[PDB]
């Protein structure tokens, strides 16, 4: 009986990947790039394998605090593809091509399954090489590896209360297929882009 040590059973934990509070009166919302590089508790587990393939399960938990209304939220997942919003009332929120999802605070939390979005057969977690042909191109950032952006706004117009909306995003990868294991990292991280070490 070793069935708990399975690789799908080892990584499919709905960890907090993003935690941002945005005010209401990045302009009054947040745009969070979907990547595993955020929290080192999950970043270290996924940087044990070289090539990963998974369907994510983005759970957005949102609670309100007024410096209590019943607010409507939009959570538009923009792929590696179309443009993203830059303001709160742009034309990109009313796009039909992007898989938006509308919910309220009083509802049970939002949940969507972002599928395997890469154009390779697996996500290159570690990547050795540059992206573009420019020699100042970003090292170790695969353009195929990019999931997208998860842009969340408040659907309501401006209300006379001034409140801070806390958003907690949970990404539980499922149907995980992993390849080529790696030594676990000892020294701490320095940046989320690369894999430097302090010493």
């Amino acid at each position: 009986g070793v069935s708990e040590t399975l690789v799908e059973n080892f990584l499919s934990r709905a960890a907090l990947v993003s935690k941002r509070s945005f005010e209401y009166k990045d302009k009054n919302f947040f745009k969070w790039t979907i990547n595993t590089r955020s929290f080192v508790q999950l970043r270290r587990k996924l940087e044990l394998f070289t090539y990963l393939r998974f369907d994510a399960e983005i759970t957005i938990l949102t609670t309100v605090a007024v410096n209590l209304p019943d607010l409507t939220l939009q959570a538009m997942f923009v792929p590696t593809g179309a443009l993203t919003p830059e303001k709160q009332d742009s034309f990109h929120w009313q796009s039909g091509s992007n898989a938006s999802v509308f919910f309220k605070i009083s509802d049970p939390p939002a949940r969507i399954t972002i599928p395997f979005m890469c154009i390779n057969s697996a996500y290159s977690v570690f990547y050795d090489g540059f992206a573009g042909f420019e020699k100042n191109g970003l090292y170790g950032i695969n353009p195929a590896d990019t999931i997208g952006n998860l842009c969340v706004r408040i659907v309501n117009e401006h209300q006379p209360v001034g409140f801070t909306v806390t958003v907690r995003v949970y990404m539980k990868p499922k149907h995980i297929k992993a390849w080529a294991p790696r030594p676990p990292r000892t020294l701490p991280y320095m940046s989320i882009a690369n894999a430097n070490y302090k010493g």
């Binding site: 977690v125 050795d128 090292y139 320095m190 940046s191 894999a195 430097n196």
Partner: peptide
Amino acid sequence: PEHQRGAHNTNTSPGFDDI
């Protein structure tokens, strides 16, 4: 495989001359 290197005591990416 995929030996993404890391520079010492700096948060700057390794360049084309260092890879």
